């Protein structure tokens, strides 16, 4: 139940400090690390089937973070305002980006879904070789 | 997989007036999804006999799924946008639905391409014409 | 166990005259039940000590608007008729949502072929292309 | 041999009623289900190889139907012109379409071959984001 | 000889076909030869430190070129059959059999789907919307 | 294997002047190909011991391979098409080569896309611009 | 000595501590090397399952961690602005160029060896697909 | 060490004879076949892990040949000036082409990279079916 | 620590002969061969896990080469143009190209990554077959 997870800062927290905001974000990173998604795998030994869960990496997201610390995207975007907090926001979003990038690069996360999410572009060069 | 029968405790044609009640209803849908995986039949053999076992697959959350479950029309759901308390709940619920599918596809628990299309994740490209003449 | 789907008809019989949303929903639900009770079957082989054994394994049957209408024995023209009366069009919208959702969740779980289903549902690939040709 | 299979209605059949034509079509459908194609697979045990035929779904086709009931495509097409048979042709062609769609959707027939045969379209949206 | 380029019907060298039955009979000989002559994929197995090898049969795709080659008529002569209707119906029938053999084989993944799709001329259909603002 | 050393019984730089002589040489190539598969090394283990064994793989026939084998240049072979007495043999040999590769690719014994390009099998598509107006 | 150390990447920092002020190429390059070593010493981990006699065993398998310029700056604890500022002195600019080249090569070599996802890395490095198209419409 | 391999004609040889030039090319072909690349493959049993190198086909290349016979690509191109040597160059490049084509067709070499190297083209026909 | 590897030619060498430069390039080639990358492979026996490192081919790059011999890319391009060094640069780059091509062809290196790096192009022929 990922939608139930909330930081220790409680309901509708007010952040008037970088240290406090960053710590709440770190609680989210910690929760993601501690709460992988589960893939049910089936095994069998001599006529008996045993179904055991296998951990899969959970991709970090900004909506996941904000839901966790119990604020709206709009409030999160409000933090961008004060430089004090804006620095924390930048760092948290970079962590989210790098988690997904490193996960995808290590084939722990689906590469194309992450490439699309991160906005990694395909670059190409096309030559028209039609004789004139 | 009798999903078309599933309904929240709020029953038929509920009139939501409270954001906590609407959110609780949405949470009932999320709980239902988690408790009701789709099933893949898998077969194994041993000493001359074949054994079949259903294996749990993640069920993708959808807005139409949610609304059917809490028994409102998509039109009713859009009405909630018209007042701030309910609209905040709609946004929260839609973000949960998006993230469930994104994280599921990212972990290859859901088919990545179909989820990418559903979520509107775009392919971005840069193309140079090297024969501009 | 036989895939004679061309023989499957609802209990409502030939050419139902639905005058009721409860009635029409009821008919739609009979179709959904048949689909789930009637998976496709795939033969899988297993070896053991010099002998191979075959076992059929259930595969999800995709719902379709065509299937539903054929099953309840109304024409597509009749199905679109229901739209005329906002009474039945509400039941039609609900059925089509169920059919869409069945195939979407099936495909998402890889129980149905994702590309077949993406084309069927009309899920689009979206792209953004920048021309970076110098100038 | 699939080119040898024929309905109980004999050579160059004439169809006097929709029930007769439908009966012949259903014979084709039933023949298809009773005659899967076979993938040959090998298994090994203690030095010997076993060749195990494994059943693969046979896709229905209109030309297969017409070969089976022993009429040309041209003749089949004339049945649309009979007021007593037209609805049967429609029904038969719809069964053929549905069998392939359901089979492909269930991963029992090759998805791309069926998608092309059925005319299932890919839809896309493209935005030119070149700065002006 | 029994290699594919050597295989021939029981009508022999350069048969001049002037009947539907004789022609259809010849075509069936080809269809039967194709079924009797799958291609072979070698597979290896290990047992107690000795490797063992045996092949599995792979479906041979039917082709119009293969058929004409087998019944020993040129493609030119085959086209000629199109002109007279006696033969024309047999030609159409045979070509439908060839098409369906490959189509069903590919649908069952017993033949390579993309090779067959290109051969049969099965088309990809698409719809594209330019959503560039303006 | 030294495939570049394989040569028909017609010797060095033969000067073909008969269609039966050219066809016989082409047939020696066809047989050589069918008789000389490529070989892939595969590993096998048993209770902690490993053994390797070559497994036979289909060799694709090619016009360049044919000409190398009968020992004429590719350009000489192209010349044969203009020759009244040799042209039919060229056409026939090129058909055998095409047919072998087609059957191999269709049977998944040769790489499908490499063969599709080699044979010139085309992809056909139909595209509708559905941009509203 | 062959299991997850559990070092959280967002916590990782060089021995130079908080907000270091790099005033020599040597100090800077040493810090960059700490990052390169950290990446090597802290792979990502994939959980894999095994079984023997009806018991399910979990075990982590190491997966290569891709180096990134953002990763480096976070590790040595300077902002992107500061990193870009290093370009002002020919002194530090050489270190920056070399560090970025190391990062590029680590990813390329990882991807080429199938240790990192090829397409993810190709997009990251800006490796282009080049094509030549002939219009053969009878004209 | 492939960059150290050299023909028996020594350093920067001068080829005057077509037979000498062909003989050198054949030394290269022989060297390629005697020097496959190796893939390490791991096997395990009862707690022990064993590694085994497996031979992989080495793709012939014109640059590889010229490095081996120790001439520059420029020198190689210069051979075209003499009808004599030009025939040997064509024969050699033809052997190189076929080795890679046949290896790729048999999936002993990566087919798409070989397709690009050989310049095998994708041919398509595209119909604009937009209604008017 | 590949970022610490350096040729016997020391820091920021100023090369004055083709033999010296070629010698330095060969040290790099030798280093690459002696320094494969490692994939951890896991096996299980009796509820215990065995980890085994497996060698993976390291791709040669001009960037790796210049880092190893400790010169800038512009220095390297300067060698391209130097009458006395240009031949050696061509030779070194040809070695690097062929190592990656052969590795990719053998599937020992990722084919698409290498294809992009080598600049191998996809060639196509397109007919527009629209009616009118």
Coordinates of N, CA and C in Angstrom, one line a residue, chain D residues 2 5 21 32 36 41 44-45 47 51 53 56 68 71 74 76-77 81 88-89 98 109 112-113 115 131:
Chain D
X2 N -4.0 -30.4 -45.9 CA -5.1 -29.4 -45.8 C -5.8 -29.1 -47.1
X5 N -8.8 -31.6 -47.6 CA -10.0 -31.6 -46.7 C -11.2 -31.0 -47.5
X21 N -25.8 -23.9 -46.0 CA -24.5 -23.2 -46.1 C -23.8 -23.0 -44.8
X32 N -10.9 -27.0 -38.8 CA -9.7 -26.2 -38.3 C -9.3 -26.5 -36.9
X36 N -4.9 -28.8 -35.8 CA -3.9 -27.8 -35.5 C -2.7 -28.1 -36.4
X41 N 9.3 -30.8 -31.7 CA 10.2 -30.4 -30.7 C 10.9 -31.7 -30.3
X44 N 15.5 -35.1 -24.9 CA 16.5 -36.1 -24.8 C 16.4 -36.8 -23.4
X45 N 16.6 -38.1 -23.4 CA 16.7 -38.9 -22.2 C 17.6 -40.1 -22.3
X47 N 20.3 -40.6 -23.7 CA 21.0 -40.9 -25.0 C 20.2 -41.0 -26.2
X51 N 11.0 -37.2 -30.4 CA 10.4 -36.1 -31.2 C 8.9 -36.0 -30.9
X53 N 5.5 -34.0 -31.3 CA 4.7 -33.0 -32.0 C 3.8 -32.2 -31.1
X56 N -0.2 -26.4 -32.6 CA -0.3 -25.0 -32.8 C -1.6 -24.6 -33.5
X68 N -12.3 -25.7 -48.7 CA -12.9 -26.7 -47.9 C -14.3 -27.1 -48.4
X71 N -15.7 -24.4 -53.4 CA -16.2 -23.4 -54.3 C -15.1 -22.3 -54.5
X74 N -15.0 -16.5 -56.2 CA -16.0 -15.8 -57.0 C -17.4 -16.4 -56.6
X76 N -18.3 -18.0 -53.7 CA -18.5 -17.5 -52.4 C -19.1 -16.1 -52.4
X77 N -18.5 -15.2 -53.2 CA -18.9 -13.8 -53.2 C -20.3 -13.7 -53.8
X81 N -25.2 -12.1 -52.7 CA -26.3 -11.6 -53.6 C -27.6 -12.3 -53.3
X88 N -25.6 -15.3 -43.8 CA -24.6 -16.4 -43.5 C -23.2 -16.1 -43.8
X89 N -23.0 -15.4 -45.0 CA -21.6 -15.1 -45.4 C -21.1 -14.1 -44.4
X98 N -12.9 -13.2 -36.0 CA -12.8 -13.3 -34.5 C -11.9 -14.4 -34.0
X109 N -1.4 -17.1 -31.9 CA -1.0 -16.9 -33.3 C -0.1 -15.7 -33.3
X112 N 2.0 -10.0 -35.2 CA 2.1 -9.1 -36.3 C 1.5 -9.6 -37.6
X113 N 1.6 -10.9 -37.9 CA 1.0 -11.5 -39.1 C -0.5 -11.3 -39.0
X115 N -2.3 -9.0 -37.1 CA -2.6 -7.6 -37.2 C -2.6 -7.1 -38.6
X131 N 12.2 24.9 -32.5 CA 12.0 26.4 -32.2 C 12.1 27.2 -33.5

